Design a binder for this molecule. Structure first.
Ligand code: W71
Ligand code: W71
Lengths: 245, 296, 242, 57, 242, 99, 57, 49, 50, 48
């Protein structure tokens, strides 16, 4: 009664028989905005089931050389579903997330992925190598949306910070000999009650292979990693026309 | 009368579930007597890091321990203890001959990300709320004290930024200014937590404008206005050449600190302010290195 | 006026002096403080969080930096072969520098408390094995073989569903506190040595990788505290920040 | 009396400070309460498990 | 004398420092304070007073300056024609600068609260018409047509005995407060946009002016407050006052 | 026409939520707004010149000489108050001299 | 005791100030009462009317 | 500010003057003091030896 | 003008007059003019021994 | 990416051999007559 689990939101149900418990970011369940924490005076929308549900956004292929990937969040779910709509139509957005990363293999494969949530995940550049040039990461790199983006210098998380310490963040590991999925529930984290789903990404999801994938030849070589996630307590306000970015 | 699913519908629960509680911890935890344990079914030592939680194994479960009454204080590890230490965050030059700041006045954009020591400490957290004590140490480049009168002026964003030593803005009718001689002890003043956000943000993963976000504008990524507190202007009070080359060092001591969401400590040399850029060709290891894992 | 007599220390600016100073904004009222997740109260809160210990702090190719985060263990042939070794000292240069604990230590002159190092095995479900992790208190030179290493504090780890095992490095010191240990003289404050040996052997069936890796995660125990804070040495930049 | 305008207002922690001005943000840093919550970062698990047990059942 | 130790800040003159100072006239007693009408207690009292919003801030001929105080509305032919447009931002340059609110904002760094803008129709009693005033929250680009503008906060105004209608620009912001908005980056604090469209059309009988004007009066709502006061930028003179 | 500001509330123009506004109005009081030292006078005592040689000057006490302070007060028609006058002296270079 | 000679004497507002001299006008500006009266400038109407109504009947 | 009038002796550094001075380490807590044999309280204790 | 800085063992010891260590972000430093009375400060019983 | 927008379930193979997909009664009408290509496709249940 701990390695098996079932997550159900809206009209979606995830199943798993080799889980490793559930992490609750900074020990706090997603909640709605207090009546004294808020400022925006207009009465918000809380679509509920039409937005708070599981969206299986993408699949990556784990290879013996993979460096690791990341997805910025608020963003990732735009353009997709009714959630995406309320996000374009409304100025203000607020919500928590249930992130379920899955990846399975056989008892004969081996490897370990680090799945973490890094709030305010600001990306950096190599500064032109020499570090004299003040370059800046493009809209394509900072906000890749679904499809995510691959890291180029995971050791420093492409931001000059040691990944070795990334675990001070709500994380969980996917060690093939042990489990086949990570589940992290993240509460709304920002210095404001609401913010724009468009120009601000409350956090990023990192999926990095710390112990490389390996297996003797002949075993299925296609080990995918799929990202499924669900907004929780989504609230929107500041209605206007639909804006893309 | 209602539809039920509306009556239960927990939508609109403003309070967070919690799951953890803050307990008193004035001293380090004491060690209690432990004895041998030879049994099945109970394995403290065994853990599953995958879960994402730190090993809760106690010393008592790994060895027969004595009893120790730990009375070591944990006071010096509080945020206030750790942060309420004045540190250099700004430096302003007011030379006689030069290209930097002649004319006799300067405008320092209030940004503490300019110096490595202080910057790294704060970049330990994602959000920080606090008041501060700013102290201004002025003198000549030789470190000599000179009979010169200065005027420091905090210029909130939106206020007229002085364009010359004799700018009308120095009337400082509503801005807070300070007049000090370099012969008087360094000026010190108390600043509150100004900012429309509930906390200053060391890292802002996003943009502030809502536009096209083309190449040229990638300069604005990570730029969060809730952190731009305005500028700090200084001038030698008068209408003629200073007569002495000056320098002002700005020290900041945080107080009444609250911090949130710890992050990994800075790994690579810093390159620019409000921009985590690192040197791609000089990516060094977090620390020292050996020759083999089987040798010290 | 009221008779006063100023004393030594007058006009001095003491960085750490905690006094008062005139407020620049009369009647100013800060923005309300919303509720935000993950508030930190004491740094010790962070020291009990496990972070990856770069035991394998050998590689430097910038292409192989990710390789330090884990050391290998593979099917051996002999008996009691030595896997890896490292200093228990956390404030000292070395593997601990990769950890949040080691990093926060740089900020304090002395520390006290037991330490823990959980080792997670990342090989295939099919691979079995027993290892012997040993903490060798001060004075004991790096054990030459297992038969010597076992005389100290240790743990025999068996690979199974429970991926990882945790080695507790109890606070065994002569002094109440320890200043950072560092080769010359200050080696007086050394914590000791950790050595990993093969208790039996890494066994695997046909069709499974003959070599896998272990990951070390380290942190401080509940009795851990630090005092007398200074500035981290570890790092200092170069060209004034642009 | 005095203005309640320091950064740590409504803070669940209790501080004892000194001040000579009407604005409380001018007060000293002061001594304060020592409460901690490790579990928040070290054990943000949904269903807790004890050390005596095997984390995976 | 009594032992003292002067600290940093000694001898400094802090503009905003509120302390005491020796009185120049011992036992002097001021002239009694008669009762005078219109005493002000808080500036907010003034911010809730409507002042003319120069929506039509286009003319500059010094002969046509009075023309800015009101924009026209006239019998159109098409459907959903755009009448006028303007930023909701009050501390920003533009129309709001003509208002007492905008002026008092120049004196404070940040503000918060809903705003109101009452539009009074000054045409002939015989002229009818319906307009659609719309507030478009942040992120929404200036609506290209009515069908787009209506998706935001709005009001359909019908001309009748009640000359004017008031558009409430609710406080819809991500932050608790807003610093003055201004093109570069600080456009982050923009309030939004107001656009006026013809709902139906300006209708009039024969014998009545085919074009009339609307006057905008704006102020702040009850939930409005400002903080962190600075100096107004707007204005600064030139030749020292003679 | 009546001459009164619209009393329309936000609640009447849109469906509003509930917000507990605890933002202070303290900084908007007259004392907050005005109790800020500002320049109102400047007096020259040069060695060589036509302004004030001889070594003394007579400044007619009038605060209407400087734009910043003047505009603030001209916001009102009548004002009653006490004041704190501070006198900052030095040479034109901003140098402090034993005088 | 002390001279009652500050500009705000007989003022309907209540202030709490500091002073070290016999003349009260030397006292600090101090913290004070926050009462407002918008209607005086925003609604100086003789016969009030509510928002719900049509201002002209 | 509060009216004061500094007197002779101001700024002097008197070796034997026993006053206070700003603490360099805020909230620092010393190592506990174990029990050690032979504690001395007064030098007279030594003079009778 | 001088700057005194206590440098606990393990902290970066300044290598020059302009060493980065003088930012003294956590170390306790004192800034004094030789014209100001001699600087005086209070130190506790630091040491791992009793 | 399109199919997931509807009602669904992620099934993981394990000791529990099978998983069950519940096709909830989501209809406009209270009852459904047999669905069949022409017009009566009005009563279609949906797609798996
Ligand atoms: C009198 C007087 C007082 C002053 C200076 C007052 C300065 C108040 C500064 C408050 C700074 O808070 C900050 C928060 C964040 C950042 C930051 N820099 C990079 C992004 O975050 C900098 C400062 O000048 N004159
Ligand atoms: C000691 C000592 C103190 C002083 C100066 C005392 C000055 C008191 C000034 C009070 C000024 O009140 C004013 C009111 C109105 C105006 C005014 N100027 C244009 C019309 O109104 C100027 C000053 O000098 N020596």
């Amino acid at each position: 009664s701990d390695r098996v689990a079932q997550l159900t939101i809206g009209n979606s149900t995830i199943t798993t028989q080799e889980a490793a418990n559930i992490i609750v970011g900074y020990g706090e369940w997603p909640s709605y905005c207090s009546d004294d924490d808020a400022t925006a005076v207009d009465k918000p929308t809380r679509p509920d089931v039409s937005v708070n549900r599981f969206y299986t956004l993408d699949t990556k292929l784990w290879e013996k050389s993979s460096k690791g990937w990341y997805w910025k969040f608020p963003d990732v779910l735009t353009e997709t579903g009714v959630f995406g709509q309320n996000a374009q139509f409304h100025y203000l957005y607020r919500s928590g997330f249930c992130i379920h990363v899955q990846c399975n293999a056989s008892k004969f494969h081996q490897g370990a992925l680090l799945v973490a949530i890094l709030p305010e995940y600001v990306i950096g550049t190599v500064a032109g190598g020499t570090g004299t040039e003040d370059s800046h990461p493009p809209y394509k790199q900072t906000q890749p949306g679904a499809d995510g983006f691959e890291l180029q210098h995971p050791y420093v998380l492409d931001a000059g910070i040691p990944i070795s310490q990334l675990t001070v963040c709500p994380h969980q590991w996917i060690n093939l000999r042990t489990n086949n999925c990570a589940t992290i529930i993240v509460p709304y984290m920002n210095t404001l009650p609401f913010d724009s789903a468009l120009n601000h990404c409350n956090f990023g999801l990192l999926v990095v292979p710390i112990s490389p994938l390996d297996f003797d030849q002949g075993a299925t070589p296609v080990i995918p990693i799929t990202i499924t996630l669900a907004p929780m307590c989504s609230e929107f306000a500041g209605l206007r026309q639909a804006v893309t970015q | 009368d209602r539809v039920a699913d509306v009556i239960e519908s927990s939508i609109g629960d403003s309070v967070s579930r919690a799951l953890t509680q803050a307990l008193p911890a004035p001293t380090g935890q004491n060690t209690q007597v432990s004895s041998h344990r030879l049994d099945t079914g109970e394995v403290p030592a065994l853990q599953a890091a995958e879960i994402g939680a730190s090993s809760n194994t106690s010393d008592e479960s790994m060895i027969e321990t004595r009893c120790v009454l730990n009375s070591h204080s944990t006071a010096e590890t509080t945020l206030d203890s750790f942060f309420s230490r004045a540190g250099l965050v700004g430096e302003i030059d007011l030379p006689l001959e030069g290209t930097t700041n002649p004319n006799g006045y300067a405008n320092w954009d209030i940004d503490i990300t300019g110096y490595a020591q202080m910057r790294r400490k704060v970049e330990l957290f994602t959000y920080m709320r606090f008041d501060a004590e700013f102290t201004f140490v002025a003198c000549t480049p030789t470190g000599q004290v000179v009979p010169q009168l200065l005027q420091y002026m905090f210029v909130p964003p939106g206020a007229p930024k002085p364009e010359s030593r004799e700018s009308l803005a120095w009337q400082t009718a509503t801005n807070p200014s300070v007049f000090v001689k370099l012969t008087d002890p360094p000026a010190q003043v108390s600043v509150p937590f100004m900012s429309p956000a509930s906390a200053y943000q060391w890292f802002y993963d996003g943009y502030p404008t809502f536009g096209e976000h083309k190449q040229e504008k990638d300069l604005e990524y990570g730029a969060c206005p809730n952190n731009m507190m305005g500028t700090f202007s200084v001038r030698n009070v008068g209408s003629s050449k200073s007569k002495y080359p000056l320098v002002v060092r700005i020290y900041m001591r945080m107080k009444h600190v609250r911090a949130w969401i710890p992050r990994p400590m800075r790994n690579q040399n810093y390159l620019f302010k409000a921009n985590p850029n690192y040197a791609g060709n000089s990516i060094k290891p977090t620390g020292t290195s050996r020759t083999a894992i089987t040798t010290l | 006026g009221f008779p006063t007599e100023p004393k030594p220390g007058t006009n001095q600016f003491l960085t750490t002096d905690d006094g008062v100073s005139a407020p620049i904004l009369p009647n100013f009222h800060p923005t309300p403080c919303i509720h935000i997740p993950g508030e930190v109260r004491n740094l010790l809160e962070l020291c009990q969080v496990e972070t990856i210990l770069e035991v394998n702090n050998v590689p430097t190719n910038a292409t192989s930096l990710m390789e330090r985060l884990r050391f290998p263990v593979s099917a051996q042939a002999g008996k009691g072969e030595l896997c890896a070794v490292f200093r228990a000292d956390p404030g000292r240069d070395g593997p601990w520098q990769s950890t949040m604990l080691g990093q926060l230590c740089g900020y304090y002159t002395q520390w006290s408390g037991s330490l823990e190092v959980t080792f997670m095995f990342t090989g295939s479900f099919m691979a079995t094995g027993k290892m012997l992790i040993a903490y060798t208190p001060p004075g004991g030179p790096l054990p030459k073989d297992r038969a010597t290493a076992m005389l100290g504090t240790h743990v025999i780890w068996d690979f199974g569903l429970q991926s990882s095992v945790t080695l507790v490095i109890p606070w065994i010191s002569n002094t109440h506190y320890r200043a950072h240990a560092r080769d010359g003289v200050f080696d007086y404050y050394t914590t000791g040595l950790v050595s990993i040996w093969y208790q039996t052997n890494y066994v695997v069936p046909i069709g499974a990788p003959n070599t896998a890796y272990i990951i070390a995660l380290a942190a401080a125990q509940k009795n851990f505290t630090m005092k007398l804070c200074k500035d981290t040495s570890h790092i200092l930049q170069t060209a004034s920040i642009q | 009396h005095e203005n309640s305008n320091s950064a740590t207002e409504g803070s669940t922690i209790n501080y004892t400070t000194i001040n000579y001005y009407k604005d409380s943000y001018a007060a000293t840093a002061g001594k304060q309460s020592l409460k901690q919550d490790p579990d928040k970062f070290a054990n943000p698990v949904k269903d807790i498990f004890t050390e005596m047990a095997a984390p995976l059942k």
